Design a protein around this ligand. Structure first.
Ligand SMILES: C=C(/N=C/c1c(COP(=O)(O)O)cnc(C)c1O)C(=O)O
Ligand SMILES: C=C(/N=C/c1c(COP(=O)(O)O)cnc(C)c1O)C(=O)O
Ligand SMILES: C=C(/N=C/c1c(COP(=O)(O)O)cnc(C)c1O)C(=O)O
Ligand SMILES: C=C(/N=C/c1c(COP(=O)(O)O)cnc(C)c1O)C(=O)O
Ligand SMILES: [K+]
Ligand SMILES: [K+]
Ligand SMILES: [K+]
Ligand SMILES: [K+]
Lengths: 455, 455, 455, 455
């Protein structure tokens, strides 16, 4: 049902298990914002799966073989051919992480005033699109915004919404389609191969380019192998390669599915766009031959991307997350369904039904979770959504969630039991969670540095 | 009941998950002898807890700080202060592993014709004693020889047998008392502090020296804290320090409870014996300042010994083994009781009651365990007992067992579930396990290179 | 005269020692462009001192202690305290490398239309200034533009030019003064403490902010200790701390004087500007607590910055470069004088006086240097100067040089002898060096991908 | 003339350069015995080339790939095939270092009362021979004991002395011939291929086995390629393979020419002796599949042995030692000639002509060298020779030397200049070196723990 880890523990990381009362002052010191907690004070850190993964002995062997040359590093050539082989794109430009590649793509493929449409958004991805003069349009299926609706491939793009955008705005006013795999904001929800194929057929007929946000593409490929009909016999690698055959390029954060702690890259097939990308990367990231990464990190990322193609690795990765979700569901704890590839999202609206969204139930549930359990989680609700620029009012998302994000190969099922058991106990007296309000709020990107206080 | 790992995974070790049919071919290639399997073909390797432990990030940081000098290495001084602080002995001599220290002690403290008495024996320990002209005398309590008897501190020395040996032979004819903690041969059974204090009081009255075999002393200290009355307020470190206060010295295999992959040492308080030890260590191991160890390994062992004192680490270590034993016992699988600190012993005589001991049931059970699960275990029965050279007959031990030995910090509860589930499944059709016979048998130490075939 | 290395070799890097005939074929495969050579084909790689340094055993111990948390990593706090202690600034924001910090500073401290003045410029630094709407003004002393003039502290700012800029434009139209230490473009020339104090006094009277480009600040501090009167009793650390006391902030490329292969940061004292920096860093680099760096790399940079303060390290570093310059000068090889802190610049115009600048003498000298020695050097002449886009004409710099850039702690004096001996041998038959012409030329940044053939 | 290092520095080791007065008290604390100095107090540690080598990036990559299994480790298989390929022996048994293999060989191949003859001796090698009942006979050419005689292949066995031993004692009373390459005690002097071939032809005619002490066999192979006629076109590997084709086995210390910090092995071709060796290794070292070594160390040793076959590596290694010898010779400093492969031996008899051998000039010169220069060297004279057991009097060797032993890939020519310059200055007032006498002397192996005082 739930497989054992398809690896052994090679080395362990020291942790501290501090008491509740000490956790209280830290939570107070952090303004009740888990983003402001210190790593050393956290038993199980589920803030994000980005850059928090455990590497393998093979990757660490590569770390000893860093060719740190400014140009022509063997590690770059290794990373280049690995991505060309596994993703199938013609050209690769390394970047220090995913948002470095997003900065490049948005400056290369967007004219001021054009539209960029995709299946929901991510913060840095949407920022670089809008800062380069684009207007974002969400074309995900309406079901993806419904936390409790348990349907497969919730991250699919609504082809009808896409056709509507092309007819009303014109294909020439659409910069590109930004297709994310998986869809982080909807709970790590996958996109079917049929949806990727249908988007490619519709966009190619209008000459509209398609670029993937591929940070969690391997988790996406597992869902296709598990649940999409006709792919149960295909390997993860074959599925990944076919996924990108429907794209003109991609932005990749190795910090997710490449099983590394730093790194990303930009891929594309177009020769002219690749030329302009190499001109722009030297300004922000570095040389086209290292792009803001040490040689050893290009090596670790090349090895890690190949490791992620092992079926047993990715099956266990996803099913460990599912185990935490299943234990929570069995105790009646409200969660986003179905469980995504990288995290379980607690539905703070149902968890904190005594609070309104103006009282920030997700931010307060995350604070309560750490104090009561020593687990750090991330607010993914009204605080992260920001304020509408025209009216200065809160954006009001249907998804008011607390994200329990699982780094790859770091924790065990017993750690998941600690998390689930603590949340299930907290759910018993959920009425005790107090509301929050801003005591400090920045002008932009308030989720990371804002401070709150109770009631 | 069973605690989560008090650490997270820093790095993982690649394994191959070959299916049953391939595991069968590997087992046939190995002549149905788990000792002849290749490490690369094994999912979960429970052959031994010696030298197989996962190190911490701190230990690996120390590995980068190796002072490789031939004399006066900083790593040796670090190791020296740590052992003097934690064990309380005056003098420390490093050795490449435990049997290196036993070679030194046996040559220093034994006159040809003297007696060495202890709570059972280990193979290498008793060999160095007998090769230097000593006759071994078992003075363990009679209960230790009852595999099914579930009683505490089974490893205690019978004080009456000790008093009997002193009266019959004289104190001048007794080289030393060899007190092992824990007792490996009885299943990893602990020794109480009260027994250690009584042995020290009786030997000191007759001027008899006492030297500990302390390879699993930390596991022993946990049993004292858990089960001996009056020690529930003492730290692991306090218990360890008090244990060795009743000894004149010790031999240690760091490859066990020091959480390293290589290393050991010899301790003593006597100045003159320490002087002779420094002369003898240069012949067999190396300088008194490295003793057959790289500098980085003295550092890793010094750091690891201090890590082993953390209560949460050793509690989880012992309870992970107990978890495997409890799950097997709950399904009716016959095991040695009580479960020891480092391993679970399957009673292969009861498990394969349809086979005679001449058909090697423990060897054949270990073979089936690997084929059905990818778990390697060790035969501890008639094969390891060897053949009598004078008569050419099997030595026939009362204990016909398969040893599931758990390396420290390498596996999870899910891995223990893989082991237990496979063994329980085999137990439900145990009548199908076929006997084995020699197709190749060496003249000595047949457990390591013999090959078999089914009957 | 020239000190031995104040360290020993802990580990070595494998190189290939291919003979001249193979090096020729590699050079032809690279189109006679050293930027297109593969690292694996190079014996001594003097392309740059950026990111190519050898780390210490202590830094590598830190690499094993990476706290990879997304927020609140212990490595960030270690880096934070180190910079606050050594540089004296209030606030620190990590970036993946120096140009990442320049991107942040240029967006924070520049209004469109303002002026930025400094002691010459660097490519990435001036680009971020000009892309945010600033006009660059060179206020370096006129002597800095005289390649052959051997005078001290060639990088000082001409206070009269600064006073002239303030009077003509007004202090409100000056974004900040950008003082680089050292000055890379002039050959790595230092700035005196007296010049730093005078700039601070003049700018503070007009309310003009001063930000340092401190990538090679430690090399600069050594020159002050060696050659500025009244500092021979001050430690390197004391000099560094006093240098930054005359600045409101800095951008740093740890890839230079922090003895690492990746990393940088942004410093400032203003609280409000630090708040805006934390909002902007999440868009381009990452969280204020890691800023596009792995935790292990923040640790390595924190350790490396403290190591750079050791007098013996930086003395040997600078004198190793000086050794190469002295040996070349003693044989009559024309070089830029005085020798800078990090590189020796060959005067290719004088070296290949039989060739015109349209025949690319610096590019061709670099080619011959690799073929004859296996040493890679960088063209810093007409090719790197680029082509004017409006007229399609070569930009023609007065400096037509080949840069021998020395990574820190990577090479020995014997390696410098290989470099010098080969160049001196080439100089004895310099008339044989043939000119080059484009067989391929990209539209921009031609230095990195252009290919040539002999004339 | 003297080649540059055929590698780059990947990582550096921190050193301390403490003043003379502090060095004095340490030398006093150590009883004027350099063996008792602390590593942390030494700038350049030339005590020994054993276990002090710098590893490569490839070796350190292997260190991350330790397969720590007790049996069937991939690292053992790597080491096994590498030795079989490069040395040509049938069977390999790993040991923790060379003297572990010597303990095994001496117990396997010696009957009490037999003779073991060889080209001089080493301490641990001769101890295991004599402790197993053999009488040592030196059959090296008489010239090898003359420090100043500069002849090639000084380590050759005198075939006439060998024939004399066979005629007087009988071939049945000769256990084996112990042929060392190189000969450490004579100054690291090589053995010609012709001498190895002649010894094999003479011993095989009498059925006498030949076993090599091969710790520095690669240095030996370089001398053959450099100076023996007909081998200047053969690779180092071909020479090494042919060397061992004249032996029945070997004892190897990886700590020398395998470029590692720990490790050794025993090789042989005989099946029956290999069987007995595997029985004996489990008692002293460990399993035949790891033999007292961590898996990662078997991996590093396998890689290092292959690296030592690179001509440029071993040429530079030997010529760096020769450079130190040439600088000393040019200043008139008396040394053993010719310079050996691994060390320069100062001739303390000529250096301290005002002292008799009873005043221990070599021990006192080593003390003076450290105090005046911060360089540690080893006494190789009357102190190491020991006392004659029959008369209780000093053994009086013709060679009274101070050994400046060079670890592989650790130091530069500039470090050699520091050593040479300091010794040359000390030679100017050599009359100031005071004699020493025992204030403490052990019964055996006095060189390592004895303490002395002046006059
Ligand atoms: C850091 C996170 N996300 C990163 C991310 C990024 C940016 O990648 P970097 O963090 O590697 O810049 C882009 N696209 C998606 C969908 C992402 O989820 C997170 O989910 O916590
Ligand atoms: C190898 C094992 N035991 C080794 C051992 C040793 C030998 O230690 P080394 O393996 O470190 O020599 C000494 N004393 C006891 C009680 C031991 O159990 C084992 O149980 O598999
Ligand atoms: C890459 C080089 N310089 C980079 C540099 C940079 C850019 O730093 P990063 O390369 O760390 O972005 C900034 N400031 C100065 C003065 C620099 O010299 C070089 O000289 O090869
Ligand atoms: C340690 C040294 N010698 C080791 C050695 C050995 C012993 O090797 P281990 O140090 O690896 O035991 C054997 N044979 C020779 C010729 C040796 O030189 C030394 O020369 O300092
Ligand atoms: K990270
Ligand atoms: K680099
Ligand atoms: K060593
Ligand atoms: K091991």
């Amino acid at each position: 049902n739930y497989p054992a880890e398809p690896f052994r523990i090679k080395s362990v990381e020291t942790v501290s298990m501090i008491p509740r009362d000490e956790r209280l002052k830290k939570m107070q010191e952090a303004g009740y914002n888990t983003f402001l907690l210190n790593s050393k004070d956290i038993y199980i850190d589920l803030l994000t799966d980005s850059g928090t993964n455990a590497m393998s002995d093979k990757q660490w062997a590569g770390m000893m073989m860093g060719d740190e040359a400014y140009a022509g590093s063997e590690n770059f050539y290794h990373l280049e051919r690995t991505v060309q082989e596994l993703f199938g794109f013609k050209h690769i430009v390394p970047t220090h992480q995913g948002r470095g590649a997003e900065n490049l793509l948005s400056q290369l493929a967007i004219k001021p005033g054009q539209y960029v449409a995709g299946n929901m958004y991510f913060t840095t991805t949407r920022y670089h699109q809008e800062k380069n003069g684009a207007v974002f349009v969400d074309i995900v299926r309406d079901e993806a915004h419904d936390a409790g609706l348990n349907i497969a491939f919730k991250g699919d793009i609504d082809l009808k919404k896409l056709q509507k955008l092309i007819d009303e705005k014109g294909a020439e006013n659409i910069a590109y389609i930004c297709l994310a795999v998986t869809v982080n904001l909807a709970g790590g929800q996958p996109v079917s191969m049929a949806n990727m194929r249908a988007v490619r057929e519709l966009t190619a007929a209008h000459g509209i380019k398609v670029f993937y946000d591929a940070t969690r593409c391997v988790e996406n490929a597992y869902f296709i192998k598990e649940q999409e009909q006709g792919f149960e016999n295909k390997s993860i690698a074959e599925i990944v390669h076919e996924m990108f055959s429907y794209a003109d390029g991609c932005t990749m954060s190795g910090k997710k599915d490449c099983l590394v702690n730093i790194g990303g890259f930009l891929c594309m097939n177009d020769d002219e766009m690749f030329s302009s990308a190499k001109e722009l990367v030297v300004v922000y990231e570095g040389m086209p031959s290292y792009g803001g990464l040490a040689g050893r990190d290009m090596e670790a990322m090349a090895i890690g991307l190949r490791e992620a193609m092992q079926y047993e690795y990715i099956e266990h990765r996803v099913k460990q997350v599912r185990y935490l979700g299943d234990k929570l569901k069995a105790a009646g704890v409200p969660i986003v369904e179905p469980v995504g590839g990288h995290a379980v999202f607690l539905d703070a609206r149902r968890f904190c039904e005594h609070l309104t969204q103006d009282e920030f139930p997700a931010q307060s549930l995350a604070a309560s979770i750490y104090v009561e359990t020593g687990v750090r989680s991330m607010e993914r609700g009204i605080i992260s959504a920001g304020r509408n620029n025209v009216t200065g009012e809160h954006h009001r998302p249907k998804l008011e969630t607390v994200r329990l994000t699982i780094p790859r190969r770091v924790y065990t099922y017993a750690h998941m039991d600690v998390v689930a058991d603590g949340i299930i106990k907290l759910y018993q007296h959920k009425e005790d969670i107090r509301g929050l309000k801003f005591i400090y709020e920045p002008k932009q990107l308030r989720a990371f540095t804002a401070r709150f206080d109770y009631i």
